[PDB]
Amino acid sequence: GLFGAIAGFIEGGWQGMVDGWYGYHHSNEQGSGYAADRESTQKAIDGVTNKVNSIIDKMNTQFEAVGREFNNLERRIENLNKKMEDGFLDVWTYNAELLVLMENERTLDFHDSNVKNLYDKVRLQLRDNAKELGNGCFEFYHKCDNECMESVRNGTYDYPQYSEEARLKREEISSGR
Amino acid sequence: GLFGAIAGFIEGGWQGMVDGWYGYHHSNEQGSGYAADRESTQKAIDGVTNKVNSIIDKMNTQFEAVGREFNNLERRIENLNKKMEDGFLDVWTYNAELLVLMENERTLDFHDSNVKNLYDKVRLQLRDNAKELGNGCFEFYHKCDNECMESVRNGTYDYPQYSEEARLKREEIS
Amino acid sequence: GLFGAIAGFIEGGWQGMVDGWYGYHHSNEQGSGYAADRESTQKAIDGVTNKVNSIIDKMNTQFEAVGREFNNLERRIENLNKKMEDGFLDVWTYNAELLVLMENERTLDFHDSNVKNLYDKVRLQLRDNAKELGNGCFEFYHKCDNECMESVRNGTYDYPQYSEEARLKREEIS
Amino acid sequence: PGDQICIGYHANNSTEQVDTIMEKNVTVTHAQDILEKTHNGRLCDLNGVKPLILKDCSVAGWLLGNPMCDEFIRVPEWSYIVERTNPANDLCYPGNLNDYEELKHLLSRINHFEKTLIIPKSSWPNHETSGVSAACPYQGVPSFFRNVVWLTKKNDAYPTIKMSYNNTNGEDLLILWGIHHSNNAAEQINLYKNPTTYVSVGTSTLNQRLVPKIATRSQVNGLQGRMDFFWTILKPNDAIHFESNGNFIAPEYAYKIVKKGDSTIMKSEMEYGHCNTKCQTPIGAINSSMPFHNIHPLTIGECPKYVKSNKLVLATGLRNS
Amino acid sequence: PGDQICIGYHANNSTEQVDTIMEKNVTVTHAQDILEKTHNGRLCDLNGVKPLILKDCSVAGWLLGNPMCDEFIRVPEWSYIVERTNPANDLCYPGNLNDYEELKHLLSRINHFEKTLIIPKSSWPNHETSGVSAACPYQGVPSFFRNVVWLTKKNDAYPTIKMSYNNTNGEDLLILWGIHHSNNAAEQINLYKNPTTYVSVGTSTLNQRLVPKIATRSQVNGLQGRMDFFWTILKPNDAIHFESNGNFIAPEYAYKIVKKGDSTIMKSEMEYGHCNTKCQTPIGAINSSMPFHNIHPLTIGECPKYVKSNKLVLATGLRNS
Amino acid sequence: GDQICIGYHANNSTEQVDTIMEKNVTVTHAQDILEKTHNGRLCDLNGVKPLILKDCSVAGWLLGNPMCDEFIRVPEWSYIVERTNPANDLCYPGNLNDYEELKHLLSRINHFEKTLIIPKSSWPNHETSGVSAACPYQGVPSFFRNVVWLTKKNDAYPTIKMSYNNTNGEDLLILWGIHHSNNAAEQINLYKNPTTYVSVGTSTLNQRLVPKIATRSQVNGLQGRMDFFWTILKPNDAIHFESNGNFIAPEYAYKIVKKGDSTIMKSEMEYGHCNTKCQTPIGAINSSMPFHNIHPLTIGECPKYVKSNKLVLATGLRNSPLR
Ligand SMILES: CC(=O)N[C@@H]1[C@@H](O)[C@H](O[C@@H]2O[C@H](CO[C@]3(C(=O)O)C[C@H](O)[C@@H](NC(C)=O)[C@H]([C@H](O)[C@H](O)CO)O3)[C@H](O)[C@H](O)[C@H]2O)[C@@H](CO)O[C@H]1O
Ligand SMILES: CC(=O)N[C@@H]1[C@@H](O)[C@H](O[C@@H]2O[C@H](CO[C@]3(C(=O)O)C[C@H](O)[C@@H](NC(C)=O)[C@H]([C@H](O)[C@H](O)CO)O3)[C@H](O)[C@H](O)[C@H]2O)[C@@H](CO)O[C@H]1O
Ligand SMILES: CC(=O)N[C@@H]1[C@@H](O)[C@H](O[C@@H]2O[C@H](CO[C@]3(C(=O)O)C[C@H](O)[C@@H](NC(C)=O)[C@H]([C@H](O)[C@H](O)CO)O3)[C@H](O)[C@H](O)[C@H]2O)[C@@H](CO)O[C@H]1O
Ligand SMILES: *[C@@H]1O[C@H](CO)[C@@H](O[C@@H]2O[C@H](CO)[C@@H](O[C@@H]3O[C@H](CO)[C@@H](O)[C@H](O)[C@@H]3O)[C@H](O)[C@H]2NC(C)=O)[C@H](O)[C@H]1NC(C)=O
Ligand SMILES: *[C@@H]1O[C@H](CO)[C@@H](O[C@@H]2O[C@H](CO)[C@@H](O)[C@H](O)[C@H]2NC(C)=O)[C@H](O)[C@H]1NC(C)=O
Ligand SMILES: *[C@@H]1O[C@H](CO)[C@@H](O[C@@H]2O[C@H](CO)[C@@H](O)[C@H](O)[C@H]2NC(C)=O)[C@H](O)[C@H]1NC(C)=O
Ligand SMILES: *[C@@H]1O[C@H](CO)[C@@H](O[C@@H]2O[C@H](CO)[C@@H](O)[C@H](O)[C@H]2NC(C)=O)[C@H](O)[C@H]1NC(C)=O
Ligand SMILES: *[C@@H]1O[C@H](CO)[C@@H](O)[C@H](O)[C@H]1NC(C)=O
Ligand SMILES: *[C@@H]1O[C@H](CO)[C@@H](O)[C@H](O)[C@H]1NC(C)=O
Ligand SMILES: *[C@@H]1O[C@H](CO)[C@@H](O)[C@H](O)[C@H]1NC(C)=O
Ligand SMILES: *[C@@H]1O[C@H](CO)[C@@H](O)[C@H](O)[C@H]1NC(C)=O
Ligand SMILES: *[C@@H]1O[C@H](CO)[C@@H](O)[C@H](O)[C@H]1NC(C)=O
Ligand SMILES: *[C@@H]1O[C@H](CO)[C@@H](O)[C@H](O)[C@H]1NC(C)=O
């Protein structure tokens, strides 16, 4: 997509995540599991709901009485009504089709954007304490327990605490050990 | 926003920046202050102005005379005029309302992209010579003075001149 | 809306890239040359073709006969037809001009996004085995022959293979 | 190995597909259609007001009282009129109703309608009022329009009629009358005794003088004669004035009429459905808040915009895999 | 204790709000409305041409010269016509003007207009030309239309009229005439002495023959009689031929007319405002470059597209915090 | 150090597109969606040739103006082409009733066959040799070819009582008229009956026409007028005529079949021996583009008419300078 995350470096979605639109999967020695990011999921749901509602609510409907009230000696006037009725059908059809096409492209890019923002927030926190895999995952160079994982999820991840332990691990892989 | 900057990792705009749409805030031993990026601001001003003028100047206006010229035994024909007038009002209202909603979303994301591109430009010069704080700020390692700060906003950050000084600092916290 | 690559940190396109829209340029011991990225170029071509065809194919046309069939004592009816003709011309002209303007902005940002995504995919593969110069280029620490370059262009770059070789050179930059 | 955290997005088993400007047939986790394709298939009240359904009659036959027509009862108010595409009992005696289409438009939506006797047959003491034709049968026996009177010579005499009616009611009156066109001088004398004849009608605004055209015409309903009918709207406290020395089709019943809104005539073969609607089509009523529909162009009511489309599907979820 | 440089964006004290496709009520540092909502409340000129404002008279009354119609002085050119919603002065003698709405449309915008005396009363030597009526008073005294002549019998005679007039002026001529419908045979003889009359009018294109309709009618302005008026455009060097033996309302004045543009009648009670505009509405003029407005649907000129909206606020600044 | 670089394509294009936020932006490729080209000739519409009247109007062609050369017989057409001001409309001045509604009915005709319905020989008690100088063929007085001027024979005009039954299986367009004479002397000299009438009756038509004796202005050198009327006689229905003077009788009628509707095009051009889906007065257009700026008066399936010179969609990338 535009932001390169969905179907980009993040290959495919997660059938196993059911509690939200975007979020995290973790794996350590205690176990593994999915956790949904409620903030971005709720904002995206509200935005998408507003989009559909805006496309519907902004329409203006007024009473009209459409019939065929002209006789055999008034064909010219009926032709005027036909040219008018077909004119509005062409206008509404083209606008409705293209609006759907354009809005769907933006909606998919909106989801792609939301995922990339979540990814970038994690990357800035972890820095070199974890390795970017290029697939949407980060391999920690230190032990990250269930409480450490939540710190990454909610923004309070402490880089200096693990900076040492991470640094020693970087050397071991570097030296072919 | 679509990009991560506005109301994102930068949690709010600066009331203290009275010049420019986007710019920098510095803090060092000499002092602190704001400084706008004129090129990014002017480009954004020109873009937004062109958008508003395009929405206005592309409208084609034509002399029309709109009245009620049909009598009590031509009430079928005016219904034809009533259906025509109401149809165009519905078309114009729907398009105008949707145009504002769409363009406003694009406008907000335009400002978001401009800020993010400015942030990435600074990060490109600084590279490892500074630490990203995740809130739109860069914490230096190498004692950036006022002329050093100007070089970052200018784009002439002398990376080799500070590479060592930042390297010695970087090892101190590790 | 810009993604910062086209006319951004990549300053200008290549005349030498003649076989695709987005691509790579490499320089090593064996020489230098251009190489088009077929996958992203084809995705871009398919998408841009779909946009043009969607704008064309979604139009519904029907048979109409447009003349001037009202006499000098029916000028009120002809004015009704004039107001309808002018209304539809005003609707179509405004919509078509703005659709072109809006979709032109989107297309140029689509190209910018594709170039940026291509840059990021290379950056994730390379990691610290090379440093990014900020102009859209990467300077390798290890020796990257043509086969190595081809592995970067497709998805098969072997980061562990050159990990120590790049690490030793990265320490020898003194 | 090593501890890992990943960023990802939702996926389900949905097969819903949407189109975009750049891509076609993209599977998404959720989608919503903004096109309305469903109708209840019944004729309904328009905002709680029942339509006037003229089952086997046209408007002209219902108004003039065709003998094969008034299976109806009193409908004092309606929102629109349902006519079948080709009604059967239009004008038993061949002829025309003047300004028929404008009259139909006027009656499309009526706030109050009430047939009222204005000129009883006793008001013609010196004229025959039992004018009867076989083209207007009631149960096979020849009859005539129930709301107008065929005036015929009596005692070999057709005295010049100089009569008037004054609208003493508080509402507008729709009044219909007509002139009978004879076929030859012999028939003209046999019916009215006056070879040269006229029908003059006057109100505060109407000023009409009709003369029969005595000529040979092609047979319609087995008849070569014609009856041309005309109408007017008589304002309260106004009076209509009739002068005729033959060929007069006098009014007997009129209609109190109150108009506060406008509608049209709907061509449909369906029957009343005992339902309420905001939007009616000839093939069914629609209850929708959706902005677009593709059901039928000939709508009455507050309706979504008509489009030529099978689906307008908005992606509301994520791209699926 | 390390030095810091930050990237940020402007924020101010603005409380201006805009809506987006996905968010509502977003505060922005700057915004701009594109919906015109302001008029001047005045009736203005249209592109340097003043409108013809008929104060208390209808177009028919002004054309025929109703004595209660002031004059409005010689206005030789106008861009559009302003009538009040319910004009007080029109045909003072009851009747009709033929093709009235087409005539009103033709006169909506006129390049040159000049009243011309084409048939003076001296041209009627064998007829009485002093006819007046209490339905057409002037200062409480019976009078008549100032631009036509009520011809009646003289010395117990109405000789047949055979008159012609050649349009010697270099411009098109709008000629008005009429026929009078009497109430009974006695009154017909009292005025024209001929029981059966007619009016014949002929040009290079017009072939007209009117006959009076002598019948009872309801009183309008105290009168049961009616006068039906007709018109034509006599082209330069063309001659109109009049022919009557009674009931003829002869033309006296006619109008030189030049037409090169089209307009409409505007229904408004407002007065002239000594202003200029490109866009006029019945409640005011619009000076704007904005693409949309919501003032009034019945606009004249080059106007923004009318919409049903209260604001179209485009965001220009940033998301304010 | 070895290097790999990311970049995009650039070329020598100078094509400029416009965006909502930028103007005159050079791109590597672009496509115009506004049709601007027409072939400049008048074509068939969906394989059906139009009706082209060179010097004739619809009224003159129908009634048979002698000046209108009766060139060929087109059994069907898709639309009708007229000049702005045709030369031979009504050689004898008058009117054609409901001319515009009749013109609209004849714009697209599935089948057209001129037919003799009332021969000149069916007027044994009346003179049928009526001619006029305002209707000249080859420099000598003539008349409309499809109607007959009925004058008096042997100082007599017996009352006509004639009826024609449509025995064909297709609709019949029948035209007749009444002649307005100048004065009483002319009325006697031509019909001998001072008070005359024309009565026409069908299953739906019920018409009585009376001449108007008065002085008019001279048109085509004549002061009289001939008002023409028409009707559509359905199969197995009879039209009944009755007149004692001033009756312009029908001779040739027209079998007609109508399956669709069209309009009348005002063009001064001629046949271009071509086929098209969309016709304009200045030339046909053949394209699939959604918009055109050729001409508003189109007939056929056409793009949407817009007031625009270019609608250029960018397809390539923002292009770079010369280096
Ligand atoms: C009153 C009477 O007996 N008249 C005789 C004619 O009816 C008859 O001419 C025949 O008429 C036939 C149709 O007759 C009706 C009808 O329309 O059914 C008979 C109705 O009683 C009569 N109504 C009234 C109120 O008088 C009606 C009317 O005369 C005219 O039709 C009005 O236009 O006609 C049918 O058409 C036959 O073809 C026709 O010969 C003649 C000759 O037999 O004698 C009359 O005494
Ligand atoms: C000429 C005369 O003496 N006429 C007497 C009638 O006036 C009168 O009927 C009454 O007429 C009233 C209106 O009278 C006028 C009018 O319109 O004011 C009087 C005008 O002088 C006259 N004009 C001419 C040129 O003759 C005009 C005209 O007769 C009619 O408009 C023609 O339709 O009428 C009003 O209508 C009263 O209600 C009515 O009774 C009768 C009977 O008293 O005597 C006549 O001699
Ligand atoms: C039949 C004949 O000889 N008629 C003589 C008149 O023609 C003539 O009046 C002069 O008529 C001139 C035009 O005459 C035509 C025409 O329109 O060309 C001549 C046609 O033969 C005639 N056709 C028929 C069937 O009668 C036709 C017709 O009379 C009228 O058009 C009907 O309205 O008229 C021209 O107008 C001259 O100005 C006029 O004097 C008179 C007297 O000269 O003698 C008639 O015998
Ligand atoms: C239809 O009938 C009504 C009711 O009869 C007529 O209106 C009424 O007409 C009478 C005279 O026929 C009026 O009475 C007279 O009024 C005046 C005041 O204007 C007074 O000077 C006289 O002494 C006398 O009372 C009456 O006012 C009038 N209106 C009402 C409400 O009763 C009406 O004219 C008739 N319509 C037609 C077209 O004939
Ligand atoms: C954000 O995540 C951190 C890290 O898990 C949370 O802090 C820990 O909370 C648990 C709760 O049982 C305590 O036992 C730990 O001692 C906390 N660690 C600290 C304070 O370093 C924190 O509560 C989370 N915040 C929110 C709002 O969810
Ligand atoms: C992807 O890039 C790799 C790396 O060069 C290519 O693999 C090499 O292909 C050449 C072809 O001559 C062989 O000589 C090398 O031995 C291969 N190197 C390996 C397998 O490590 C590979 O072919 C590329 N894929 C495509 C589809 O072009
Ligand atoms: C015109 O002629 C047709 C053909 O004869 C007439 O219709 C037929 O009339 C006869 C005698 O009444 C019937 O037996 C037939 O059933 C009719 N139809 C056909 C197809 O032959 C028709 O009536 C004539 N026109 C008028 C006005 O009477
Ligand atoms: C998309 O799906 C529809 C319906 O299944 C099919 O007709 C069409 O060909 C498909 N198009 C593509 C490009 O797959
Ligand atoms: C906002 O600030 C400007 C500039 O200081 C000032 O002129 C204006 O009055 C302020 N508005 C409010 C509402 O405080
Ligand atoms: C937006 O603001 C308007 C006016 O201030 C208010 O009526 C409306 O409810 C608001 N909408 C929200 C808060 O969603
Ligand atoms: C009117 O007068 C002019 C000039 O005298 C003359 O040329 C023209 O023929 C006249 N028109 C008529 C119809 O007599
Ligand atoms: C764009 O270029 C054309 C010629 O190529 C020129 O006429 C036009 O003025 C230019 N537009 C702008 C906005 O500079
Ligand atoms: C229209 O032009 C195209 C060119 O691609 C051609 O194939 C087609 O046959 C043309 N149509 C006609 C009716 O000439």
Short mmCIF file of C-alpha atoms in Angstrom, two decimals, chain F residues 27-259:
data_model
loop_
_atom_site.label_atom_id
_atom_site.label_comp_id
_atom_site.label_asym_id
_atom_site.label_seq_id
_atom_site.Cartn_x
_atom_site.Cartn_y
_atom_site.Cartn_z
CA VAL F 27 5.71 14.34 -16.14
CA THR F 28 7.23 11.41 -17.99
CA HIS F 29 3.88 10.34 -19.49
CA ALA F 30 0.32 11.63 -19.64
CA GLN F 31 -3.07 10.84 -21.16
CA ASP F 32 -5.80 13.23 -22.34
CA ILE F 33 -9.36 12.11 -21.57
CA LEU F 34 -11.02 15.02 -23.42
CA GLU F 35 -12.08 14.16 -26.96
CA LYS F 36 -11.26 17.06 -29.28
CA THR F 37 -11.30 15.59 -32.81
CA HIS F 38 -14.19 15.29 -35.27
CA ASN F 39 -14.09 14.02 -38.84
CA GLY F 40 -15.85 17.12 -40.18
CA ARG F 41 -18.60 15.33 -42.14
CA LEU F 42 -22.17 14.07 -41.73
CA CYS F 43 -22.44 10.31 -41.28
CA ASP F 44 -24.87 7.47 -40.82
CA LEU F 45 -26.04 6.83 -37.26
CA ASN F 46 -25.71 3.15 -36.28
CA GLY F 47 -25.69 2.17 -39.96
CA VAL F 48 -28.78 4.23 -40.86
CA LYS F 49 -28.32 7.14 -43.25
CA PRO F 50 -29.80 10.53 -42.33
CA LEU F 51 -32.35 12.53 -44.28
CA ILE F 52 -30.67 15.50 -45.97
CA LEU F 53 -32.77 18.30 -47.49
CA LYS F 54 -30.62 20.59 -49.61
CA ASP F 55 -32.91 23.48 -50.54
CA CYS F 56 -36.09 22.17 -48.95
CA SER F 57 -37.75 22.38 -45.55
CA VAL F 58 -39.69 19.57 -43.91
CA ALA F 59 -42.97 21.27 -44.84
CA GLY F 60 -42.01 21.69 -48.49
CA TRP F 61 -40.66 18.15 -48.84
CA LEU F 62 -43.82 16.70 -47.27
CA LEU F 63 -46.32 18.76 -49.28
CA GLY F 64 -44.27 18.45 -52.47
CA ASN F 65 -42.89 21.89 -53.21
CA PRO F 66 -42.21 21.83 -56.98
CA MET F 67 -38.96 23.75 -56.43
CA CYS F 68 -37.91 20.95 -54.06
CA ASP F 69 -36.42 18.41 -56.45
CA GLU F 70 -38.00 15.07 -55.61
CA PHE F 71 -34.59 13.41 -55.40
CA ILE F 72 -34.77 9.67 -54.52
CA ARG F 73 -36.95 8.03 -51.85
CA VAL F 74 -35.25 7.15 -48.56
CA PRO F 75 -37.34 4.33 -47.04
CA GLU F 76 -35.89 5.04 -43.58
CA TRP F 77 -33.52 7.39 -41.78
CA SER F 78 -32.00 8.03 -38.35
CA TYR F 79 -32.15 11.85 -38.20
CA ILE F 80 -33.03 14.82 -40.42
CA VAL F 81 -30.60 17.51 -41.59
CA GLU F 82 -31.91 20.99 -42.42
CA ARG F 83 -30.09 24.18 -43.20
CA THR F 84 -30.49 27.13 -40.88
CA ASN F 85 -32.55 29.01 -43.50
CA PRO F 86 -33.89 26.74 -46.26
CA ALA F 87 -34.92 28.31 -49.54
CA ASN F 88 -38.14 26.48 -50.53
CA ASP F 89 -40.40 26.03 -47.50
CA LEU F 90 -43.95 27.13 -48.45
CA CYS F 91 -44.16 28.45 -52.00
CA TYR F 92 -47.75 29.49 -51.33
CA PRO F 93 -47.69 31.36 -47.99
CA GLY F 94 -49.46 29.84 -45.02
CA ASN F 95 -48.88 27.59 -42.04
CA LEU F 96 -48.42 23.93 -41.25
CA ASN F 97 -50.27 23.01 -38.06
CA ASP F 98 -48.17 21.46 -35.27
CA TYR F 99 -45.14 21.70 -37.53
CA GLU F 100 -42.61 21.16 -34.74
CA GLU F 101 -44.39 18.15 -33.25
CA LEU F 102 -44.67 16.71 -36.77
CA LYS F 103 -40.97 17.43 -37.35
CA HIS F 104 -40.10 15.63 -34.12
CA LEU F 105 -42.23 12.66 -35.21
CA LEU F 106 -40.35 12.42 -38.53
CA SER F 107 -36.82 12.75 -37.12
CA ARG F 108 -36.32 8.97 -37.02
CA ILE F 109 -38.59 6.87 -39.25
CA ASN F 110 -38.37 3.09 -39.59
CA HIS F 111 -40.29 2.97 -42.89
CA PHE F 112 -41.49 5.71 -45.27
CA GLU F 113 -43.45 5.04 -48.48
CA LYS F 114 -45.22 7.74 -50.47
CA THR F 115 -48.60 6.45 -51.62
CA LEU F 116 -51.38 7.62 -53.91
CA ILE F 117 -54.59 7.48 -51.86
CA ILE F 118 -56.92 9.90 -53.68
CA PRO F 119 -56.31 10.16 -57.45
CA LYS F 120 -57.09 13.33 -59.36
CA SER F 121 -59.72 11.33 -61.29
CA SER F 122 -61.89 11.09 -58.14
CA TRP F 123 -63.03 14.73 -58.59
CA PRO F 124 -65.42 14.56 -61.56
CA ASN F 125 -67.59 17.53 -60.49
CA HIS F 126 -64.69 19.82 -59.51
CA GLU F 127 -61.69 21.36 -61.25
CA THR F 128 -58.30 20.06 -60.11
CA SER F 129 -55.99 22.18 -62.30
CA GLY F 130 -55.27 24.83 -59.65
CA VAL F 131 -51.84 26.45 -60.07
CA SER F 132 -50.02 29.49 -58.72
CA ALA F 133 -47.06 31.60 -59.79
CA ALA F 134 -45.57 31.60 -56.28
CA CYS F 135 -45.14 27.81 -56.75
CA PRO F 136 -43.20 27.75 -60.03
CA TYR F 137 -41.78 24.58 -61.60
CA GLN F 138 -39.44 25.21 -64.55
CA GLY F 139 -40.56 28.84 -64.74
CA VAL F 140 -44.29 28.15 -65.19
CA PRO F 141 -47.02 28.18 -62.51
CA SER F 142 -47.44 24.89 -60.64
CA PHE F 143 -48.67 23.63 -57.27
CA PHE F 144 -47.82 21.23 -54.47
CA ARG F 145 -47.40 17.74 -55.90
CA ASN F 146 -49.11 15.85 -53.06
CA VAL F 147 -52.22 18.04 -52.62
CA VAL F 148 -54.78 19.28 -55.16
CA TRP F 149 -56.32 22.76 -55.43
CA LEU F 150 -60.05 22.10 -55.90
CA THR F 151 -61.73 24.91 -57.87
CA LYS F 152 -65.23 25.13 -59.32
CA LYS F 153 -66.40 23.29 -62.45
CA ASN F 154 -69.15 24.64 -64.74
CA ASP F 155 -69.87 27.50 -62.30
CA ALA F 156 -70.64 24.88 -59.65
CA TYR F 157 -69.03 23.54 -56.48
CA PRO F 158 -71.05 20.52 -55.31
CA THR F 159 -70.59 19.61 -51.66
CA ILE F 160 -67.87 16.96 -51.32
CA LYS F 161 -68.64 13.93 -49.12
CA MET F 162 -65.60 11.66 -49.45
CA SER F 163 -64.06 9.05 -47.12
CA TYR F 164 -60.84 7.03 -47.44
CA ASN F 165 -60.22 3.82 -45.47
CA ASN F 166 -56.63 2.95 -44.55
CA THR F 167 -56.45 -0.53 -46.10
CA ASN F 168 -52.67 -0.75 -45.63
CA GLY F 169 -51.13 -2.43 -42.61
CA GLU F 170 -49.11 0.64 -41.58
CA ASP F 171 -49.82 4.12 -40.26
CA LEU F 172 -50.76 6.78 -42.82
CA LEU F 173 -49.67 10.41 -42.50
CA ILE F 174 -52.28 12.46 -44.40
CA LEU F 175 -51.98 16.18 -45.12
CA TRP F 176 -54.76 18.55 -46.20
CA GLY F 177 -55.39 22.28 -46.11
CA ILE F 178 -57.77 25.19 -46.46
CA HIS F 179 -57.20 28.19 -48.74
CA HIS F 180 -57.83 31.69 -47.36
CA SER F 181 -59.10 33.89 -50.19
CA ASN F 182 -58.59 37.64 -50.43
CA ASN F 183 -62.13 39.02 -50.89
CA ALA F 184 -65.70 38.16 -51.84
CA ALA F 185 -65.00 38.59 -55.57
CA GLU F 186 -62.13 36.10 -55.42
CA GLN F 187 -64.21 33.70 -53.32
CA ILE F 188 -66.94 33.61 -55.99
CA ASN F 189 -64.42 33.48 -58.85
CA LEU F 190 -62.76 30.37 -57.38
CA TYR F 191 -65.47 28.42 -55.49
CA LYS F 192 -68.82 30.16 -56.28
CA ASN F 193 -70.01 29.47 -52.73
CA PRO F 194 -69.76 32.52 -50.45
CA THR F 195 -70.01 30.69 -47.09
CA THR F 196 -67.76 27.63 -47.04
CA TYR F 197 -66.27 25.12 -44.62
CA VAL F 198 -63.90 22.16 -44.42
CA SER F 199 -64.86 19.25 -42.15
CA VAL F 200 -62.44 16.41 -41.38
CA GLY F 201 -63.36 13.44 -39.21
CA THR F 202 -61.63 10.27 -38.05
CA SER F 203 -62.09 7.97 -35.06
CA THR F 204 -60.31 10.67 -33.02
CA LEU F 205 -60.08 13.79 -35.21
CA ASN F 206 -63.16 16.04 -35.30
CA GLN F 207 -62.29 19.24 -37.16
CA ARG F 208 -64.19 22.08 -38.83
CA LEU F 209 -62.31 24.78 -40.75
CA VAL F 210 -63.81 28.03 -42.04
CA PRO F 211 -62.05 30.44 -44.44
CA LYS F 212 -61.01 33.88 -43.22
CA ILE F 213 -61.89 36.56 -45.78
CA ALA F 214 -59.73 39.63 -45.14
CA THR F 215 -56.80 41.56 -46.59
CA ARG F 216 -53.27 40.52 -45.60
CA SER F 217 -49.76 41.62 -46.52
CA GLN F 218 -48.10 40.31 -49.67
CA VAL F 219 -45.89 37.23 -49.28
CA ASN F 220 -44.26 35.61 -52.33
CA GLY F 221 -46.32 38.03 -54.42
CA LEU F 222 -49.59 36.76 -52.94
CA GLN F 223 -52.06 37.95 -50.31
CA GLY F 224 -53.89 34.64 -49.83
CA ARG F 225 -52.84 31.87 -47.46
CA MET F 226 -53.07 28.09 -47.33
CA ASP F 227 -53.20 26.60 -43.83
CA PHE F 228 -52.21 22.93 -43.86
CA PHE F 229 -53.13 20.26 -41.31
CA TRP F 230 -52.25 16.61 -40.76
CA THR F 231 -53.22 13.46 -38.90
CA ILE F 232 -52.02 9.90 -38.34
CA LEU F 233 -54.64 7.53 -39.73
CA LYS F 234 -54.38 4.18 -37.97
CA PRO F 235 -54.90 0.95 -39.94
CA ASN F 236 -58.53 0.00 -40.65
CA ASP F 237 -59.73 3.51 -39.76
CA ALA F 238 -61.46 5.92 -42.12
CA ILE F 239 -60.90 9.65 -42.59
CA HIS F 240 -64.04 11.53 -43.66
CA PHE F 241 -63.90 14.74 -45.69
CA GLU F 242 -66.71 17.24 -46.28
CA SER F 243 -66.34 20.64 -47.92
CA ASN F 244 -68.12 23.06 -50.25
CA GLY F 245 -65.13 25.27 -51.08
CA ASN F 246 -61.59 26.32 -50.19
CA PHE F 247 -60.62 22.66 -49.67
CA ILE F 248 -57.05 21.65 -50.54
CA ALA F 249 -57.54 17.90 -50.98
CA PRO F 250 -54.90 15.22 -50.33
CA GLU F 251 -53.50 13.26 -53.26
CA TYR F 252 -50.34 11.54 -51.97
CA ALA F 253 -50.09 10.17 -48.43
CA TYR F 254 -47.19 8.54 -46.58
CA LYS F 255 -47.08 5.06 -45.09
CA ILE F 256 -45.14 5.38 -41.83
CA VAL F 257 -43.65 3.09 -39.18
CA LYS F 258 -42.08 4.63 -36.08
CA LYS F 259 -39.83 2.65 -33.74
#
